[PDB]
Sequence to fold (296 residues):
Amino acid sequence: EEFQCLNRIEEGTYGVVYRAKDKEIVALKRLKMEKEKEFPITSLREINTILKAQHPNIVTVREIVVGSNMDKIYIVMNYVEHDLKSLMETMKQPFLPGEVKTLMIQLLRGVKHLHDNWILHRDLKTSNLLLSHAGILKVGDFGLAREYGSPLKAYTPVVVTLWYRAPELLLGAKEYSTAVDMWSVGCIFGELLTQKPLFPGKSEIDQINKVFKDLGTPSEKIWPGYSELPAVKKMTFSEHPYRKRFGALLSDQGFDLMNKFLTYFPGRRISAEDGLKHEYFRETPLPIDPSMFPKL
Ligand SMILES: Cc1cc(O)c(-c2ccc([C@@H](C)CN(C)C)cc2)c2c1[nH]c(=O)c1sccc12
Fold:
């Protein structure tokens, strides 16, 4: 109604995003449908997070449509030219370090808005990252986003896509907050440099092994509460010592920033606010203007 679906874009979870026109090309997504009808809770949770997350580095919501006896719910949003995963598969040469810093600064600023507003996204991935022709980066999907409070409690155990899933979720952590989001940001950082996924594990066991092979095998000394972890209680993985795959590509401060991103201990994991304060973004390859981004 009121929109002509030009072409469906992609399917995520039970939600699907189309491309329509107003008079102006728009982006339209229908939220996940629920069997129980007695207003959908999952639809409301997605609506709440995306509204509170309204930010220049977040997708612009034009309208939200409900009706049909509350069976169908739609969210009208401004159409973005590209999604980041598409560029990775359709670029001849890797992103410049200045462009990477600009995208990371855009990403980190948007992440800080969510956490300051008690918002957890938990589904940070390249295909969920939208890049405009003008260099503006926005976050697209909120199908996993959820609110959290100061007194922490148990939430959704299995969250985040396996490739970007935090190790604590890979080890079945009962409580998690803001640590998984920063882990995904670190995973996206490595992908940008190499145009390839950082940890493309085939399964949860493979995902844990891939992380441990390069980042080493964590322990109680480097991670308090490792013994109490439900997975580590009845399991013991192979000890992998030491590995940098970005030789002569990432600066010394770049490695330090990445190490803080991919920190095994959630407490020692760098926050979004401290990420922007790292000297890597203030190094010799200064970030490039968003308006100066090359052609797509
Ligand atoms: C050019 C372009 C490509 C895309 O892959 C997506 C997009 C479509 C689905 C999702 C989620 C459900 C799930 N994805 C993992 C499949 C995320 C992004 C989008 C896009 N352009 C847009 O304007 C918008 S608005 C919301 C989305 C988009």
